[PDB]
């Protein structure tokens, strides 16, 4: 019958590793680098677009940074199409929580459920896993500003600063060097860009090959604002830190 | 849940020394309208069984198809289909009885009263009743509808118990049945003059009689009856 053609996506190797999860992570390691840095008064999300063409429409484009709700955003590394499946699920889950409890969903609860979905594809169903790693940046009134990452295994962890995608080894070393706890948002903006600028496989880091976002309490009194940076705003912030 | 539309009236029957007789008129009533006149309500199964059906005619026609299909199915992979493994009256009845009770238990009955008359392979007379409720019973004489009220009293004067069966000939039995059919024509408002009669004998086999008529009727005394009491002319 059909047994002949089954890859058996949800099995262990003799060493106790999940083949397909390991290979999905290998896929993600070629994707454009994404960095998340958490400051005391906000969070920065920076991401490098995959080798851009000059005729690509830059302003009306979304590849890396997605909005889950008003308080939570994600940076993507891997297959975009896979990520959008998971993002729409995550968006619905947030609205289910708000409908039920009349309160915005705590960041960890959303992260856990999305990670639990990924886990399911590694244990049962015989389907390939989602070739996606997320960086979750969000805020709630319990833990304040929070950074998480999830990967195809469905395992998630919390971070002060983290990178996913390409050159995470080099990027994590640079973040570990210059990061400190009393850091501000504007400092974190500078760290994120400086790190990408050194780890990039491109010749020089320009505005048209980046997506940028901040989550501050920089609105008016005790409320959070999400800022998905426009092309011109990235051009200005790149000049302001002296990279171009 | 149903209501019967086109309906057939009494089916009457009895045992005699060598076999069984069964009869039923050829009418398909539509309420008080005597709509259809060519309706055969006795249906032979093989050369040893006759199923007599009263009640809803659409459901009767369904039952006809089932019996017809039963003969076909029995013949499959059966070299003795016309011998030892032929359909017995007892098999045909038990099948129908099962269906009637299953349908009532699903609150969607076949709105009928059925009498299965026949002769078994060992010569024994078979005569048993079943209806929409799945109720079953056997007796030397059996009848449905008005027949139960008017025919049975007449037929029980001939065969009142088991021991009267050997003492009853086919001539005496048929005479009683034909008389009962006349009485029903006098008194049942949903009966017709035309009827069919079937005899299943252990020696002479199945004799199916069509297009019989009620005859030798007494109507002459009607001319003397005037008014309803005090009227003379």
């Amino acid at each position: 019958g059909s047994r002949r053609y089954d890859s058996r996506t949800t099995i262990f190797s003799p060493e106790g590793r999940l083949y397909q999860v390991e290979y999905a992570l290998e896929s993600i390691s070629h994707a454009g680098t994404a960095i998340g840095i958490m400051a005391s008064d906000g969070i920065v999300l920076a991401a490098e677009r995959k080798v851009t063409s000059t005729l690509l429409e830059q302003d009306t484009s979304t590849e890396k940074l997605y909005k889950l709700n008003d308080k939570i955003a994600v940076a993507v590394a891997g297959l975009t199409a896979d990520a959008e499946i998971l993002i729409n699920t995550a968006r619905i889950h947030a609205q289910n929580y708000l409908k039920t409890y009349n309160e915005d969903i705590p960041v960890e609860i959303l992260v856990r459920r999305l990670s639990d979905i990924k886990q399911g594809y590694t244990q049962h169903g015989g389907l390939r896993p989602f070739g996606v790693s997320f960086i979750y940046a969000g805020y709630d009134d319990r833990y304040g500003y929070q950074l998480y990452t999830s990967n195809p295994s469905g395992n998630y962890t919390g971070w002060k600063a983290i990178s996913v995608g390409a050159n995470t080894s080099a990027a994590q070393t640079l973040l570990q060097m210059d990061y400190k706890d009393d850091m501000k948002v504007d400092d974190a903006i500078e760290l994120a860009l400086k790190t990408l600028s050194k780890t990039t496989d491109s010749s020089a880091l320009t505005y048209d090959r980046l997506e940028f976002a901040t989550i501050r309490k920089g609105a008016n009194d005790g409320e959070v604002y999400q800022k998905i940076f426009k092309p011109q705003e990235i051009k200005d912030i790149l000049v302001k830190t002296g990279i171009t | 849940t149903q209501q019967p539309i086109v309906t057939g009236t009494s089916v009457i029957s009895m045992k005699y020394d060598n076999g069984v007789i069964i009869a039923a008129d050829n009418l398909g009533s539509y309420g008080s309208l005597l709509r259809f006149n060519g309706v055969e309500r006795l249906i032979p199964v093989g050369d040893n069984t006759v199923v007599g059906i009263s009640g809803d005619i659409s459901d009767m026609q369904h039952i006809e198809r089932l019996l017809k299909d039963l003969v076909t199915e029995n013949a499959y992979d059966n070299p003795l289909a016309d011998a030892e493994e032929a359909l017995e009256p007892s098999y045909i009845f038990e099948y129908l009885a099962t269906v009637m009770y299953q349908r009532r238990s699903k609150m969607n009955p076949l709105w009928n009263a059925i009498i299965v008359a026949g002769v078994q392979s060992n010569g024994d007379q078979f005569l048993r009743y079943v209806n929409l409720l799945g109720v079953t019973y056997s007796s030397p004489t059996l009848a449905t509808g008005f027949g139960a009220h008017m025919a049975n009293p007449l037929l029980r004067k001939v065969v009142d118990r088991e021991s009267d069966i050997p003492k009853t000939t086919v001539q005496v039995a048929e005479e009683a049945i034909v008389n009962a059919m006349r009485v029903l024509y006098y008194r049942d408002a949903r009966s017709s003059r035309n009827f069919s009669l079937a005899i299943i004998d252990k020696n002479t086999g199945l004799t199916f009689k069509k297009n019989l008529q009620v005859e030798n009727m007494k109507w002459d005394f009607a001319k003397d009856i005037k008014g309803y009491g005090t009227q003379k002319i």
């Binding site: 262990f12 015989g126 295994s153 | -």
Partner: protein, 240 residues
């Protein structure tokens, strides 16, 4: 539905998928359980290749299943969440029908049963997780420590360790733990647990987690400084 029999017997009578799930447990961070006279202590390793972590929000290694029972583990982290969730649901379901919280043996038996079901069900792989389940039965002061594994077998332990380099720490516990006289106090039990982890860990900084469970739903997690004091005390006595 995906039906494939993934867990199956081999010629020599082994179920390789279950045995390869044990290899995933062997890769996981070390976890240890030591029960004293009036308490149980669950110790857990945390690998130090991860700096820039946020320890406020990062999932803790020891999980409360109910107010009186805790569950630590070694192996795949994502897999452990599924077991913990089911265990937490069963805990509330038991309170709802029996009008009494689960015993530690019952909760263990349930978790072990789930693990077993995944070893002979179609379309699924076994859990790459072994657990240490510890706590106190309702209205009881006798300490309980149980261990489960991917195959589904479970058993009670005076002290036990699972995960990477667990054979080293099991060696330590086997000579240092006296059945006739278990750690009489909380301090003695925590120290023996920290000592055992120090055979394997590296540094006693933010690498060791300790959770103490006492009778009548009395569970508390130790902070860095509290644990560091045990590390400082043990090293000074060692230089002798």
């Amino acid at each position: 539905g995906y039906d494939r029999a993934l867990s199956i017997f081999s010629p020599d009578g082994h179920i390789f998928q279950v045995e390869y799930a044990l290899e995933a447990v062997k890769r996981g961070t070390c976890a240890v359980g030591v029960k004293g006279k009036n308490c149980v202590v669950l110790g857990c390793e945390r690998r130090s290749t991860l700096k820039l972590q946020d320890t406020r929000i990062t999932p803790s290694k020891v999980s409360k299943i109910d107010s009186h029972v805790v569950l630590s583990f070694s192996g795949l982290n994502a897999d452990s969440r599924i077991l913990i969730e089911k265990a937490r649901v069963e805990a509330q379901s038991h309170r709802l029908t029996l009008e009494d919280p689960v015993t530690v043996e019952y909760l263990t038996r349930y978790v072990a049963g789930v693990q077993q079901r995944y070893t002979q069900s179609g379309g699924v792989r076994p859990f790459g997780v072994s657990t240490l389940i510890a706590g106190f039965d309702p209205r009881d002061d006798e300490p309980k420590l149980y261990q489960t594994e991917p195959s589904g077998i479970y058993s009670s332990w005076s002290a036990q360790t699972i995960g990477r380099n667990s054979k080293t720490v099991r060696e330590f516990l086997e000579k240092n733990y006296d059945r006739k006289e278990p750690p009489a106090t909380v301090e003695e039990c925590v120290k023996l647990t920290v000592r055992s982890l120090l055979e394997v860990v590296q540094t006693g900084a933010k690498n060791i987690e300790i959770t103490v469970v006492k009778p009548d739903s009395d569970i508390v997690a130790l902070s860095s400084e509290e644990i560091n004091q045990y590390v400082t005390q043990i090293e000074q006595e060692k230089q002798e």
